[PDB]
């Protein structure tokens, strides 16, 4: 029983902080994507300008 | 004009051919499986037959399922046919065999009562204004022992009684993977067949509580086992 | 010594092996077979259980439905509609099955209980 | 102009799904005619039911046809059409019979004709 | 409507197993399920 | 008229090195009627050219777009007109689709099929969903190599068939943002050496554990 | 009374043992699937308002 | 061509005659317009051999 | 319009052999008295749909109750429209029979 | 000219037997490809293995492959071909591994290959 409960919460916080890892990677990729696409946006805008 | 129609008919025939080839290969696989099921259900039947024979050699052979009632008036016919229809002359052979059996029964003064297993038999007999007492559908592809138990129980309870004096069954015996023969068996009442002596210094059995109670509680189980074997053989035959 | 035991269901061979002793319950009363024994034919009780005892293993408990039993010179043969080993049983499902009103499934549940060591 | 950039992506997706369902139904029609509908998959039987209801729901009572049927015509906005056929391709009307989809307008007339035939929606 | 309804009651619409002429099965082709008892007792 | 078209289409050539080495590639378009490739002008231009791409309306309606019938389409030049990476990851593709097309009659009986047969069925469904492509969105050859690597390396057996496209899309997106080195050295060396394949496989596994299907389930092996 | 309570609790805490073992994977998968739909809810909003500004630009 | 089906199954070389044949509204003009658009990055490279 | 007659429909007993799926009149209800226009309003579309349903359900084992009702009604209509040669009906009797 | 009056009776017999075996294998190939190999019988397997051996022995080390492999091409006299395929259909090589039959000439090349792959008889 002691074995199982300690393993339980060990896996619990393992999961929690690794989920933070994946989701923070996600938000960095989100800012990356916004950057690249808005660059595309107004570099197309100037295309129609000329 | 008919060039469009001819190309369309070629496409239609190609679709039909693809589907039928698929169905043939599927049926090959499924009959492999059905033969497996039949062969694995065989041993229990063999051993219950042995136990029944060694019970009957030392009991009183006056069970209702064993005496031929004087002046039989009606006979129960269980016709085992299929649900899906892409078989060949399967249901056709079943029905011609059952018609021969009906004429045999009527040439001896017995009006047949009809129980069926499957959809095709119900079509064949509802078209001809027959009165089917009870029907059974949806398990001709993979029959289990509970279906056989239900069928055999209703049959023996209609026999022991609106009441019949013998039970026949018409099903397709499977053999050779190329032999599918519609056969009519008489499952009740049983004929008794003194086989042999095969009893010298052999040791006598002991029965608990006695011989006849075991015999009379084992006979309906034997009829149910036979109905189960019939369903399995008819399934393998339908797949062939 | 040992006796050959074979338990065959209606559509499958449930078990087959050798044993040291074999306890079950005929409709007439409980019974225990040993490697040599009188030829015998009997009908197990509706909620019977079959405990096989082997030399080097733990005893194997089986629940049997509608069984028949016969002992001969070769060994024991048990004929069952259905059989379920002990390490295959939900004791709670068997428990709620035991309290049914239908006698057949009630006997099924009682046998499944007897196999797991309850009731 | 049946283009994701012109009519929007929902319009386009619904149109493509309608067309795919109807093409599969046309592919199955000959098998259904010869071997019967019971030889198909359950996937395909579901698709065939949906496709027959879609083929019937595309028909409409037109204003210029009141002389051939005696029944006045109806108008269906494009958003109502998109929503209706989205529900049809998802399977929300698999219980309503084949009729009640035949020569009607939008979804409320579908409800009315379904209740005239004993069904919900 | 009422004329049709009062007419349909008196209308005589023109709506048994056939023979099939199938011969009798041979009495020995019908298989008999037997208990094969081992005590010879004629 | 055969001369009219063959005189035109034989001026598309690949010149030798002593003539400069220039080339003219031809893409003649022919519009058939009711898929009658046995007509006169279709027969002529099929006779003339070096390969054919047969587009069909039945494939177009089923959602297969571009509606290229890969069973009858052909290129008589073949692997000589490919880079090493694409010649490797797509030499597996032709008979995969052949097996899938001859197995799709058993789509409703995958329970009755052998292990390898159901494997071929699932792989073929995935590969058919792989060759689909939007309009006016061409992909460079490195991204095509990566996508067909997804297809034929088996990294799509975990993804639902109704999720392949998006999956591939997002993966390429990820690879364009994070791991540009794989695409770069594919573009520069024209071959996908084993180490690039290792890094690509690991990238695929990470993206998988990050990817969320539409049914809510997982895509991790 | 204490011996039967003893092995009763014993089988009861074997029960509790593997139930806690299962709960481990239970809310592990819960947390990480939450993380998946979070990581894809994000980065899809990003693409969406990306197209927002593509078109107004 | 930038099209996976063509570039993988029926590859086109430089100097080859590839017929695009279809009924109508099947996507032939789209195939050729995408083959044209795919040469944008080869044009940006400024290399006369590419 | 056209009244397309067929030899298959003729041999099947459908006389006149008018194929209702392709037969049509481009004047419509204006070429009818009001009674017949209200009575035989959607008869041609009903019979076309019935022929389609009976061609679809040619081998189907069990169908909806509405499909069965439609099959019976379409049949009865088919046998109602058959008529011997050299045997005309006044427009009132035709109205009454289509009302039936 | 695959006619007894031109090639001889034995040539015709051997060719017809090879064609029968290959056609039966072609019949079995689809059930093999969908259901698996030992879904079949063991007579069917005997035939399938013999047919694989025969179908692979029809290949040859062609004179056109010498430029790529260096080893010269083969020229098998028709009598030796008849003898080899007669023995192949009789079953005299059902144990030699399949790869021993790819791109070889007469019977002696088959024997040498079998020896360099650890089998004979
Ligand atoms: N890859 C694709 N994905 C989705 N839609 C496509 C694709 N290719 C073409 N289409 C659509 O198919 C329609 C027909 O395309 P296209 O005009 O290229 O065919 P076509 O061969 O030129 O036909 P026609 O010459 O008869 O006009 C277009 O409206 C286009 O939107
Ligand atoms: Mg065009």
TrEMBL record, chain A:
It is found in: Cell membrane. Signal peptide: none annotated. Residues 1-47 form a coiled coil. F-type ATPases have 2 components, F(1) - the catalytic core - and F(0) - the membrane proton channel. F(1) has five subunits: alpha(3), beta(3), gamma(1), delta(1), epsilon(1). F(0) has three main subunits: a(1), b(2) and c(10-14). The alpha and beta chains form an alternating ring which encloses part of the gamma chain. F(1) is attached to F(0) by a central stalk formed by the gamma and epsilon chains, while a peripheral stalk is formed by the delta and b chains. In the N-terminal section; belongs to the ATPase B chain family. This protein is part of the stalk that links CF(0) to CF(1). It either transmits conformational changes from CF(0) to CF(1) or is implicated in proton conduction. F(1)F(0) ATP synthase produces ATP from ADP in the presence of a proton or sodium gradient. F-type ATPases consist of two structural domains, F(1) containing the extramembraneous catalytic core and F(0) containing the membrane proton channel, linked together by a central stalk and a peripheral stalk. During catalysis, ATP synthesis in the catalytic domain of F(1) is coupled via a rotary mechanism of the central stalk subunits to proton translocation. This is Multifunctional fusion protein. It comes from Mycobacterium tuberculosis. The lineage of its organism: Bacteria, Bacillati, Actinomycetota, Actinomycetes, Mycobacteriales. The gene is atpH. The chain holds residues 51 to 100 of 446 of the full protein.
Automatic annotation (TrEMBL), chain G:
It comes from the Bacteria. It is found in: Cell membrane. F(1)F(0) ATP synthase produces ATP from ADP in the presence of a proton or sodium gradient. F-type ATPases consist of two structural domains, F(1) containing the extramembraneous catalytic core and F(0) containing the membrane proton channel, linked together by a central stalk and a peripheral stalk. During catalysis, ATP synthesis in the catalytic domain of F(1) is coupled via a rotary mechanism of the central stalk subunits to proton translocation. Belongs to the ATPase B chain family. F-type ATPases have 2 components, F(1) - the catalytic core - and F(0) - the membrane proton channel. F(1) has five subunits: alpha(3), beta(3), gamma(1), delta(1), epsilon(1). F(0) has three main subunits: a(1), b(2) and c(10-14). The alpha and beta chains form an alternating ring which encloses part of the gamma chain. F(1) is attached to F(0) by a central stalk formed by the gamma and epsilon chains, while a peripheral stalk is formed by the delta and b chains. This is ATP synthase subunit b. It comes from Mycobacterium tuberculosis. The chain holds residues 58 to 114 of 171 of the full protein.
